[PDB]
Amino acid sequence: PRYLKGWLEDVVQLSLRRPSVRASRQRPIISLNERILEFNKRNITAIIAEYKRKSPSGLDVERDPIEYAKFMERYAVGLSILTEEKYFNGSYETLRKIASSVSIPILMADFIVKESQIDDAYNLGADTVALIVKILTERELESLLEYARSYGMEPLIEINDENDLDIALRIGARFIGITSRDEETLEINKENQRKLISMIPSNVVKVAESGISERNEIEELRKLGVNAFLIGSSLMRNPEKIKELIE
Predict the structure, then answer these.
(1) C-alpha pair distances (Å), 151 with each of 6, 67, 111, 120, 126
(2) 129 — alpha (psi -120 to 50), left (phi > 0) or beta?
(3) CATH number of residue 162's parent domain
(4) Contact 193, 178 (CB under 8 A)
(5) Which SS3 state, helix, strand or coil, does residue 247 take?
(6) What is the number of structural domains in the chain?
(7) DSSP string of 105-139?
(8) Is the separation of the CB atoms in 46 and 40 below 8 Å?
(9) Is residue 19 part of a domain?
(10) How far apart are CA 20 and CA 92, in angstroms?
(11) Does the residue 214 lie in any domain?
């Protein structure tokens, strides 16, 4: 991994020791990025709803994950399942049960630093994974991207600054998450998010992440080229909000 400190250094060290799983996957990969493009062509707002019990940027929510996933299956373009344990209270077992229960694309979101976490995602039923440029070196990014693609997955490459974006383009990313939240400091800066979005080629599928709460923001960002929107805590607290954001 890259040189880090504080909680990111910790979570990376923890992730290096994440025990791998032995599970058999049940269904072919279904592409999240391709379904987003299809929603775009159908003029349907594409929201990726996140399931997460806890995070550094919110209070814990304890709700039925299957109920949540089945509700969101009617409206969301895909689901993101947090599986990091210490800071997000995630679990691989929640990923597996949700993936066994719904038929929309599933992104496994964690701090992926080793190949066996990609094996884990595949074996638990996820259709893709996130890779985070802030924590991975160029070499790790290219290797883990190639490995995920060898399973048929197209990872979401997560960026937060111009240097991160340059690397995502350097490694040939086709699917980029532009987060307004700096994972190290938790600062939300949407001016910077919009700047990075404006510098991404048209043929990359772009997901705006963090700080999305109003239909009007979705409309503005769509006009700026954003293809989909990742929304977590607001929907953990009030799942029905997704209905307003799509209409």
Answers:
(1) 33, 29, 19, 12, 11
(2) beta
(3) 3.20.20.70
(4) yes
(5) coil
(6) 1
(7) -EEEES---SHHHHHHHHHHT-SEEEEETTTS-HH
(8) yes
(9) no
(10) 10
(11) yes
Non-local CB neighbours of 2 within 8 Å, separated by 6+ positions? 134, 135, 136, 137
Residues 6+ apart with CB under 8 A from 32: 48, 77, 78, 105, 106, 107, 127, 128, 154, 156, 175
The verdict on residue 10 lying in a domain is: no
5 falls within a domain? no
Contact yes or no for 56/7 (Cβ under 8 A): yes
Q: Rounded CA gap, 231 and 208, in Å? A: 9
User: How was this one solved?
Assistant: X-ray
Domain that holds residue 54: 30-246
